[PDB]
Symmetry: none
């Protein structure tokens, strides 16, 4: 819900099918993806932090639920 679907490496490993005519200019698409890649790289740390906090959030909530059940023995 909150973390990125794609990573920098998904973007810079991506290639597209080629068409004989009326496709998009390759130099223009590649230059645009150059900047997109740079943005994903810049976001990597913050996205790693949101994933780590999310998984730890889930683990804390689960242990809290388990222990609250234990004290209600």
């Amino acid at each position: 819900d909150v973390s990125l679907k794609l990573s920098a490496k998904d973007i810079y490993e991506k290639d597209f099918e080629k068409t004989m005519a009326r496709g998009y200019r390759r130099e223009e698409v590649d230059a645009f993806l150059d900047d997109i890649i740079a943005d994903y790289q810049k976001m990597a740390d913050m996205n790693n932090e949101v994933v780590k906090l999310s998984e730890e959030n889930h683990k804390l909530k689960k242990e809290l639920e388990e222990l609250r059940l234990r004290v209600a023995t």
Copy 2:
């Protein structure tokens, strides 16, 4: 700190590639790929707020967990 990016979700949405009569990239495949990237940029816009939200709730959850571990083995 907040992260300054080259592009926004709006920039990617508004990007119009030239259609070339030479060998080029398949339009529908490029467009579908950019659709996924748009969604990620939406997530980037909100991500720092979500890190703050997760960090604060996690600190609260950790304090409640420590208290429960004084009460249950």
